[PDB]
Design a protein around this ligand. Structure first.
Ligand SMILES: C[C@H]1CCC[C@H](C[C@H]2Cc3cc(O)cc(O)c3C(=O)O2)O1
Lengths: 31, 171, 31
């Protein structure tokens, strides 16, 4: 096996991108 | 005149429908307080016979609403009368009606989106379009079409003021 | 029964307000 080289992304943790988001909703109490 | 008050009623009914559908709880909080809060205003003072103390008419329900959010009721609103003991003019009456709502886990960005949706939606529903004619100086003055088509323009207070003044403000 | 008066909302259909919305998402094909 070839000698180890750490990934350029750092090696800490898998890339975790910030994604778009949507304010959650609660149901109509009267419905 | 009748038509104006029909429109007024439609506005309130629209808002209740909007907030109900988003899971808000319509609530009633005290209109008489030991300490008025939630706004900047001169209060009305009255005497309460049973408790033998003066009380103030509310200027805003804001602090009660936030305590209920603390209580775990995540979404609340109230359409009701507030009292401010100040001047009377074309846009000011000592008792007037407001809607306040509070929404857990929301920030101001969320409320701008909700505000745009509610107001534009309201205007289109009630009038048939996003554009409303208004006479800011009455029928003897010029009229302007007001365009409620979203999204609404945004400006930052200090930034825009500095631009309008041609100078920088102190922090 | 008292004589009929149509509701001020018109009587056509139940008020149906425009509500806030959130762009739907599709799943990562690689996930
Ligand atoms: C709760 C607030 C939020 C901002 C708009 C509006 C401001 C409010 C101020 C205000 C103060 C006052 O002394 C008498 C009045 O008739 C009003 C009003 O109608 O508008 O309602």
């Amino acid at each position: 096996p070839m000698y180890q080289v750490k990934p350029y992304h750092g090696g800490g943790a898998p890339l975790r991108v910030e994604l778009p988001t949507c304010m959650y909703r609660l149901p109509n109490v009267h419905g | 005149v009748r038509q104006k008050f029909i429109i007024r009623s439609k506005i309130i009914t629209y808002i209740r429908s909007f907030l109900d559908e988003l899971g808000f709880l319509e609530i009633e909080t005290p209109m008489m307080n030991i300490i008025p809060g939630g706004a900047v205003a001169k209060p009305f003072i009255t005497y309460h016979n049973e408790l033998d103390m003066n009380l103030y008419m509310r200027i805003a329900p804001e602090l009660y609403h936030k305590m209920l959010v603390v209580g775990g009721i995540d979404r609340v609103y109230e359409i009701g009368r507030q009292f401010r003991n100040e001047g009377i003019d074309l846009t000011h009456n000592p008792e007037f009606t407001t809607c306040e709502f509070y929404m857990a886990y929301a920030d101001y960005h969320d409320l701008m989106e909700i505000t745009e949706k509610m107001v534009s939606g309201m205007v289109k529903h009630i009038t048939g379009s996003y554009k409303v004619t208004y006479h800011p100086d009455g029928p003897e003055g010029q009229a302007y079409d007001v365009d409620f088509t979203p999204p609404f323009r945004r400006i930052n207070m200090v930034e825009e003021l500095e631009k309008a003044l041609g100078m920088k403000l102190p922090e």
